[PDB]
Amino acid sequence: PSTGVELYLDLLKRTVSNFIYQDATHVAGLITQAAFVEEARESGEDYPTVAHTMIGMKRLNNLQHCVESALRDGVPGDVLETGVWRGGACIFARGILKAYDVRDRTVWVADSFQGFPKITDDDHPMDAEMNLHQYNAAVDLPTSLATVQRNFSRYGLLDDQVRFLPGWFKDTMPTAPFERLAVLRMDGDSYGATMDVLTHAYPRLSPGGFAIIDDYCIPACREAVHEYRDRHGISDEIVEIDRQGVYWRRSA
Amino acid sequence: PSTGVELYLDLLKRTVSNFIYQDATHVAGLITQAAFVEEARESGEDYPTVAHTMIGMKRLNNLQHCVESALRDGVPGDVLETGVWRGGACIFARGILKAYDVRDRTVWVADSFQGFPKITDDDHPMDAEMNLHQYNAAVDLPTSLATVQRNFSRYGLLDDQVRFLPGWFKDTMPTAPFERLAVLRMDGDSYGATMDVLTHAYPRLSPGGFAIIDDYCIPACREAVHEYRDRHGISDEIVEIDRQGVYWRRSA
Ligand SMILES: CC[C@H]1OC(=O)/C=C/[C@H](C)[C@@H](O[C@@H]2O[C@H](C)C[C@H](N(C)C)[C@H]2O)[C@@H](C)C[C@@H](C)C(=O)/C=C/C=C/[C@@H]1CO[C@@H]1O[C@H](C)[C@@H](O)[C@@H](OC)[C@H]1OC
Ligand SMILES: CC[C@H]1OC(=O)/C=C/[C@H](C)[C@@H](O[C@@H]2O[C@H](C)C[C@H](N(C)C)[C@H]2O)[C@@H](C)C[C@@H](C)C(=O)/C=C/C=C/[C@@H]1CO[C@@H]1O[C@H](C)[C@@H](O)[C@@H](OC)[C@H]1OC
Ligand SMILES: Nc1ncnc2c1ncn2[C@@H]1O[C@H](CSCC[C@H](N)C(=O)O)[C@@H](O)[C@H]1O
Ligand SMILES: Nc1ncnc2c1ncn2[C@@H]1O[C@H](CSCC[C@H](N)C(=O)O)[C@@H](O)[C@H]1O
Ligand SMILES: [Mg+2]
Ligand SMILES: [Mg+2]
């Protein structure tokens, strides 16, 4: 990075993922030690105790790629992340728009702001077995709307181009008041959250727009992706980002 | 802030002072609670447990003012900080040069890298009384050269335009290899450290350059400043920054 924009976006990635102060990770899943590990934060594989995003540098770089490509190529629409936790990825998205002085696109921040949902008999069997709800406390996942707003304000990026969609995706997505998306970033882990958002938000993704599946390594997530793509006859190349995420670019 | 440069430098200030994650302060001096207090970090009056600078937002803004004015006005010379702790103010200084693609100026980082010196019989009576050495561990002040280098690297700002002057100022300043300074930032607290640097570095401060006295609220520091100014017939207006620091701009 040499230009002001390049320096800003580089620093913003380093800051939301907190390579700057390198906070400890929660101990959960495959992470058995609390110590900061560079490689884990680089590929977004730990559970930061303090950092504002857990998606890591490779998926932040991907988000930047997708937003910049949409801007460059004149792909119409907003940016939506479904599953935002402390807000770091959406903060970075808003910063990208800020850096290029884009005044006519919005970052939509969608989340229960309550962590993973309690499982009921309505849930897909794979979601029920996985029961993501059980690790809400373990990785400090429930994060209120007020806290996420607090966090945008800390980098000076809380403004009218950031809009919030509080609630469960099955409830908020069908009538969410955006008309077009240039980037749809899905990070809700489950079959349910993935299918909710593909069903109700993907049709508003512009041709040339990007669909990012953060959690593709999770079998329930991946099953929703393939079910949805099969149903709609979507054959757009699935491109791998790191050990967790993939994306495709919508051809039509 | 709206340009890439403005956004970058704004974020860099917020990051080195850690308004982003808002670390606790040490409980020392007039600070009686550990909790982050916005006003205290804004004015640089606490003792951050994690942040890379303790000078606060107002004195960061002042440093930016002085460096940008020197660049704008074509004042020749490098930037020197005497007393750098974890390096945050010097990191920010390097960032300013980076933002404007300045390739012909250096940030000089001068410190014992060991905290305040033990008092000897040679010390000024006010320094002996104050005995700053007593506070080293309490506010985690001793910070090694390796750690400071580590810290610049985290921002991507460790390069050949950052040079280090390890040692006591009375030892390092008289023969420090720089020829001219555009900004001289003094943050060594004591009569001794202030007089060391005024004596041996100030004569290399260019006309139009800036002399920043971070610690002017400390009587021993202020005593050195007026003794030095009186000796050299310096009458340049002393301008307040906040409740600790002042600066003047050199006319003669
Ligand atoms: C710590 C929280 C995570 O828990 C996990 O990562 C939980 C992984 C469990 C422990 C695994 O199960 C174990 O596999 C071993 C090979 C054998 C072991 N024996 C005893 C049976 C067995 O316990 C995995 C394989 C369980 C299966 C069902 C699975 O795929 C679980 C996924 C759960 C992911 C949980 C949510 O993590 C999310 O992962 C995404 C990839 C990230 O992007 C991020 O998404 C927002 C993250 O959210 C915190
Ligand atoms: C905890 C470490 C600091 O300890 C301090 O901050 C020391 C504060 C002493 C205790 C103060 O004295 C007290 O003032 C009260 C209002 C009343 C109280 N009664 C009993 C009289 C009285 O004790 C101050 C006013 C003493 C005078 C001599 C002074 O200015 C002290 C300077 C010593 C500063 C110590 C070093 O702090 C440095 O202060 C600079 C202003 C900062 O920019 C920063 O510089 C690098 C910082 O370094 C950690
Ligand atoms: N069905 C659902 N409806 C709404 N939010 C959901 C949901 N299932 C999971 N979530 C939310 O999905 C998020 C997954 S963590 C998301 C990580 C985030 N993108 C980052 O940058 O770090 C959590 O905040 C959780 O509250
Ligand atoms: N006589 C002396 N010679 C060299 N370094 C000294 C010194 N007296 C004090 N110091 C150093 O002065 C520093 C004061 S703290 C400086 C704070 C720093 N400018 C910031 O941005 O946060 C300490 O790092 C200490 O090691
Ligand atoms: Mg994920
Ligand atoms: Mg000071």
Swiss-Prot record, chains A, B:
UniProt GO BP: antibiotic biosynthetic process; methylation
Enzymatic reactions: mycinamicin III + S-adenosyl-L-methionine = mycinamicin IV + S-adenosyl-L-homocysteine + H(+)
SUPFAM superfamilies: S-adenosyl-L-methionine-dependent methyltransferases
Annotated residues for binding of S-adenosyl-L-methionine: 53-54, 81-85, 111-115, 169, 187-188
Protein name: Mycinamicin III 3''-O-methyltransferase
Cofactor(s) essential for the protein: Mg(2+)
Gene3D superfamilies in UniProt: Vaccinia Virus protein VP39 (3.40.50.150)
Function noted in UniProt: O-methyltransferase that catalyzes the conversion of mycinamicin III to mycinamicin IV in the biosynthesis of mycinamicin, a 16-membered macrolide antibiotic.
Gene that produces this protein: mycF
The species this protein was found in: Micromonospora griseorubida
A Pfam family hit: TylF
GO MF term (any one): small molecule binding
Pathway(s) annotated for this protein in UniProt: Antibiotic biosynthesis; mycinamicin biosynthesis
Similarity section: Belongs to the methyltransferase TylF/MycF family.
Major enzyme class: transferase
